[PDB]
Amino acid sequence: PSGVEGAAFQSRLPHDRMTSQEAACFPDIISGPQQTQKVFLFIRNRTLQLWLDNPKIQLTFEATLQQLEAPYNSDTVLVHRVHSYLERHGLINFGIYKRIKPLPTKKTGKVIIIGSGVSGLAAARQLQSFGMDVTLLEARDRVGGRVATFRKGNYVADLGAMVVTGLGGNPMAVVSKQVNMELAKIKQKCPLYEANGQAVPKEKDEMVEQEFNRLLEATSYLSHQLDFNVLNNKPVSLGQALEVVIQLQEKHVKDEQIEHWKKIVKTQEELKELLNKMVNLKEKIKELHQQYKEASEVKPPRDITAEFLVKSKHRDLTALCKEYDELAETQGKLEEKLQELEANPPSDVYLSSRDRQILDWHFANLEFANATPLSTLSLKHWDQDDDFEFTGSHLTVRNGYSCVPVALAEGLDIKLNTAVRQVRYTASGCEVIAVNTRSTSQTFIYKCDAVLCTLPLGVLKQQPPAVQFVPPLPEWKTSAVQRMGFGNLNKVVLCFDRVFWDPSVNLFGHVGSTTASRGELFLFWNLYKAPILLALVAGEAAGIMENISDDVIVGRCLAILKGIFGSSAVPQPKETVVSRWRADPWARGSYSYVAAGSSGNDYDLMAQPITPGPSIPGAPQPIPRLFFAGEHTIRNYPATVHGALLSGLREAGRIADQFLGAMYTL
Amino acid sequence: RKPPKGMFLSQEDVEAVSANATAATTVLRQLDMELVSVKRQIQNIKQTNSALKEKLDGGIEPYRLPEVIQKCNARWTTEEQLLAVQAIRKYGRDFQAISDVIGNKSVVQVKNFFVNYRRRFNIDEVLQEWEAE
Ligand SMILES: O=C(Nc1ccccc1)c1cccc([C@H]2C[C@@H]2NC2CCC2)c1
Ligand SMILES: O=C(Nc1ccccc1)c1cccc([C@H]2C[C@@H]2NC2CCC2)c1
Ligand SMILES: O=C(Nc1ccccc1)c1cccc([C@H]2C[C@@H]2NC2CCC2)c1
């Protein structure tokens, strides 16, 4: 899209209507006449544009009005409200911009942010920019969280997020103009190679892929049009629905052969019955010829009855000689029909074990996308965020994705090696109790008006608790935590001195020998300038290979690679790294997924802040003190970096509105 | 609104597979064991049909008789009047067959004949006899 209307789309907003959020800040406009709305709407859209086409500098409210054109630059406060709203919720002036208006000498309110993952860093940066005192507590010795970039010498390989999902409507686009990310497109090509190491014939690669895609669309049809979402009182998973569809597709293959061979028997017996008539007729014609000959043998001159007998038998025999011929037309006609059916026999199988093996690799990709075995995904809701996917090619960050969190950390008060252990929130405020990770006896008390928790859903899930809440989170929040799915997904980084793969290919496959091992090193990535290949471990394999040493794992890599490229071309790797995210105490997994029995509605539960009870009884109801960001709190963009970032922007808005006041509602 | 093409997903079918844990494997095996039932029965009927063909070797070709190409005639010789009365007794009212016994008379005046000599040849009486059989 183009112009002001493109700015609305590039900010994930409908250009021609007002969103529920801005209805809530501008109940006058959306409640008023259409004219004003289009004013507001245009007034918003231009402002977004101004921010967007230069997001390396603050878009100040003065520079906004200054460049509006009448009549849109006449309601001086509607502009000031619009700009204020946009600045509050980080639709403008977010990320890393050179500030025109310098920060305020003295601050307002204290926020402790748990975790300096992207969602943490994004809020901190916004909250600081609103004049609040912000400190981040971070268990690791580095920022970024699940954005984790390996760096030894000139090797640069990313153990965490690798790909930006397309700049159409993506905030990371903005970040990439403010930071030097070297973004490189991912060519959608992906050559398979099966367990032996020989490519999959383009006949197959195409038809199995096509079957996978239809098996998916099939499950979607069982879900929405047949309402197959409950089986023996339990939620149906994607995995089950896939097995159901595959079985019904095998069942049909069988039913198809049954009705076909039952067409050969229906006519083989129609033949048998015909030949019975034929054979019986031939016998009758055996007798009549003898009878005619005997009557014919009486030599003339004969009396007329003996003449009738020859004449009679003769016609009687040419009649029976007529039926036996009208029957042999019929024998010929069924003989071709029988031959015909033998010649167009239906499909012998649905999918051979050869095939089902290659289909298993399409499933490992799906299990990678969801960081979990398909038996856990909600059939109904697993893809519930498809509608919000951005437009464009997927990209990788060629200099490492760390550059982004590290950039965002500039100017922030981060306490590294500081493991929050207890969060205490009360009507009067909060204390956060952390220890030092190097030596746990060292203890820290942090006191603040509000806590922003970006603890990963796996951390929040941990039993016994890595982090204690005082008081306990309400059961509506803890239930959402149990219901949701925090998956697992691991990478092997292989660094060689010589590029020996197809350097025009970003990603190529390896078909897993078994259904169980379908996730075990099934997919390789050539994303980097240095000779680095990167191998996935997904699905049921992810949790398994965690309990297996790196040397065994880099072995199974070299084996799979050698079989596909030849033992001469594979050197030994110069540096190796094997992620283990389920074991990582500050992750306890990779990212969220919509578990069976969950829904995207849990992602909203996650994001909904906690308000403590009153200290004094009968005191007025208090302010919310505990807020939540992180990729598991944004239902429309889960399990992604732009999801994290957006959620952090969202909270810094909700928090600042609560503690600094939203003055743009009048 | 409808499944993708090639995919077969009936409402009925799913319950059958869904109803028990091993239901799919049995239902498939039923079909699997019912297919051998059908292929084993083709082999049976194919072998039975092969024999029945073994018997019809020769066709009916030793037993065919040369076609009698004969110009039709309208005059009833006393001979072929007598062929007729006999033909009527052995056939009744199959006016065609009665014509090819005679072979000089066409089909129609066999029809004619019936009324013409109806009393002189007692055709009614003759036709009663044919109805005993
Ligand atoms: O299958 C894939 N192939 C692949 C195989 C290997 C590597 C990458 C990709 C695939 C991957 C990502 C998305 C999709 C979208 C169409 C599917 N959604 C619906 C509409 C058709 C099913 C497919
Ligand atoms: O295997 C997959 N992805 C993949 C991509 C690249 C490499 C490997 C694997 C995949 C297959 C089917 C559906 C999806 C869902 C998430 C995507 N949502 C989109 C589909 C249009 C909306 C992912
Ligand atoms: O996190 C993800 N989505 C997700 C989906 C469902 C539940 C949770 C999370 C995601 C992860 C890996 C790959 C993809 C690729 C396929 C999608 N490609 C786009 C361009 C073709 C459609 C998505």
Residues A575 and A507 in one domain: yes
Residues A339 and A252 in one domain: yes
Q: Distance between the two ends of chain A, CA-based, in angstroms?
A: 33
Q: Half-sphere exposure (CA, 13 Å, Cβ side) for B82?
A: 10
Q: How many CB atoms lie within 10 A of CB A188?
A: 9
CA A396 vs. chain centroid, Å, equals: 17
CA–CA dist A310, A322 (Å, integer): 18
CA–CA dist A575, A495 (Å, integer): 5
Q: Which of A9, A2, A5 is nearest to A38 (CA)?
A: A5
Residues A560 and A529 in one domain: yes
CA–CA dist A273, B2 (Å, integer): 43
Non-local CB neighbours of B73 within 8 Å, separated by 6+ positions = B104, B105
Q: Half-sphere exposure (CA, 13 Å, Cβ side) for A71?
A: 5
* Distance between Cα A446 and ligand 2 center (Å): 42
CATH of the domain at A30: 1.10.10.10
Q: How many CB atoms lie within 10 A of CB A330?
A: 15
CATH of the domain at A376: 3.90.660.20
- Cross-chain Cβ contact A282/B60 below 8 Å: yes
DSSP-derived secondary structure letter, A612: P
Q: With contact defined as beta carbons under 8 Å apart, do A581 and A499 qualify?
A: no
CA distances (Å), origin A273, targets A277, A315, A368: 7, 26, 61
Q: How many CB atoms lie within 10 A of CB A430?
A: 21
CATH entry, B78-132, from 1.10.1040.10, 3.40.50.1370, 2.60.40.10, 1.20.58.1880: 1.20.58.1880
- DSSP three-state, residue B90: helix
The single-letter code of the amino acid at A105 is T
Non-local CB neighbours of B105 within 8 Å, separated by 6+ positions = B72, B73, B76, B80, B84, B99, B113
- DSSP three-state, residue A145: coil
The single-letter code of the amino acid at A419 is A
Q: Which residue has the tokens 């086409």?
A: A53
Residues A17 and A74 in one domain: yes
Q: How many residues are listed for chain B in this entry? A: 133
Ligand 1: which of A186, A187, A205, A209 to mutate, most ligand atoms within 8 Å of CB? A209
Q: With contact defined as beta carbons under 8 Å apart, do A517 and A364 qualify?
A: no
CA B44 vs. chain centroid, Å, equals: 25
A423: which strand partners? A432, A469
Tokens of B101: 């016994």
Non-local CB neighbours of A431 within 8 Å, separated by 6+ positions = A424, A445, A446, A447, A448
Q: CB within 6 Å of ligand 2 — which residues? A: A 216, 365-366, 368-369, 383, 386, 389
DSSP-derived secondary structure letter, A519: G
CA–CA dist A85, A432 (Å, integer): 30
Residues A394 and A494 in one domain: yes
Q: Is A563 buried (19+), middle (13-18) or exposed (0-12) by CB count in 10 A?
A: middle
CA–CA dist B58, B60 (Å, integer): 6
CA–CA dist A129, A89 (Å, integer): 12
Q: Tell me the structure's resolution in angstroms, rounded to a single decimal.
A: 2.8
DSSP A262-276: HHHHHHHHHHHHHHH
Residues A363 and A495 in one domain: yes
Q: Which residue has the tokens 């003065």?
A: A62
| Closest Cα in chain B to A281 | B60
The single-letter code of the amino acid at A576 is T
Residues A635 and A534 in one domain: no
Q: For the packed helices A238-297 and B23-55, what is the interaxial angle rounded to 10 degrees? A: 10
Structural domain includes residue A100: no
CA–CA dist A50, A34 (Å, integer): 24
Question: Which residue ranges make up each domain of chain B?
Answer: 11-55, 78-132
Q: Which of A148, A98, A94 is nearest to A125 (CA)?
A: A94
CATH of the domain at A459: 3.50.50.60
Q: How many CB atoms lie within 10 A of CB B112?
A: 13
Structural domain includes residue A326: yes
- Give the number of domains in chain A: 4
- DSSP three-state, residue A639: coil
The single-letter code of the amino acid at A208 is V
* Distance between Cα A177 and ligand 3 center (Å): 24
DSSP-derived secondary structure letter, A366: H
Tokens of A161: 């997020």
Among residues A580, A606, A630, which one ends one of the domains?
A580
CA–CA dist A400, A154 (Å, integer): 11
The single-letter code of the amino acid at A191 is P
Residues A44 and A156 in one domain: no
Q: How many residues are listed for chain A in this entry? A: 666
Ligand 3: which of A167, A172, A213, A370 to mutate, most ligand atoms within 8 Å of CB? A370
CA–CA dist A507, A190 (Å, integer): 5
Beta strands A110-114 and A133-137 are parallel
Q: How many CB atoms lie within 10 A of CB A551?
A: 9
Q: Half-sphere exposure (CA, 13 Å, Cβ side) for A95?
A: 26
CA–CA dist A421, A469 (Å, integer): 9
Known binding residues of A for FAD are 119, 138, 140, 146, 162-163, 631, 640-641
CA–CA dist A79, A85 (Å, integer): 10
CA–CA dist A238, A598 (Å, integer): 13
CA–CA dist A82, A45 (Å, integer): 10
CA A497 vs. chain centroid, Å, equals: 34
User: Max Cα separation, chain B?
Assistant: 90
Which residues in A lie closer than 8 A to residue B14 (C-beta atoms)? Answer: 222, 226, 228, 244, 248
CA–CA dist A639, A109 (Å, integer): 31
Structural domain includes residue A386: yes
Structural domain includes residue A234: no
Residues A8 and A79 in one domain: yes
Phi/psi at A468 (5° precision):
-105, 135
HEC-encoded secondary structure of A466-508: CCEEECCCCHHHHHHHHHCEECCCEEEEEECCCCCCCCCCCEE
The radius of gyration of chain B from alpha carbons, rounded to an integer in Å, stands at 32
- DSSP three-state, residue A180: coil
Residues A275 and A337 in one domain: yes
A166: which strand partners? none
Full residue range of the structural domain in which residue A468 is found: 110-142+402-480+597-665
A136: which strand partners? A113, A414
A234: which strand partners? A231
Residues A576 and A617 in one domain: no
CA distances (Å), origin B91, targets A315, A666, B83, B127: 12, 113, 12, 9
The beta-strand segments (E) located in A65-222 are: 110-114, 133-137, 149-152, 155-158, 163-164, 183-185
Q: With contact defined as beta carbons under 8 Å apart, do A246 and A296 qualify?
A: no
| CB contact residues (below 8 A), chain A span 217-246, against chain B | 217-218, 221-222, 225-226, 228, 231, 243-245
Residues A558 and A624 in one domain: no
Beta strands A163-164 and A395-397 are antiparallel
Q: Which of A341, A228, A320, A338 is nearest to A278 (CA)?
A: A320
The beta-strand segments (E) located in A303-410 are: 395-397
CA distances (Å), origin A371, targets A26, A389, A518, A541, A561: 40, 18, 13, 11, 23
The radius of gyration of chain A from alpha carbons, rounded to an integer in Å, stands at 37
Q: Which ligand 1 atom is nearest residue A383's CA?
A: 18
The single-letter code of the amino acid at A176 is S
Among residues A580, A607, A632, which one ends one of the domains?
A580
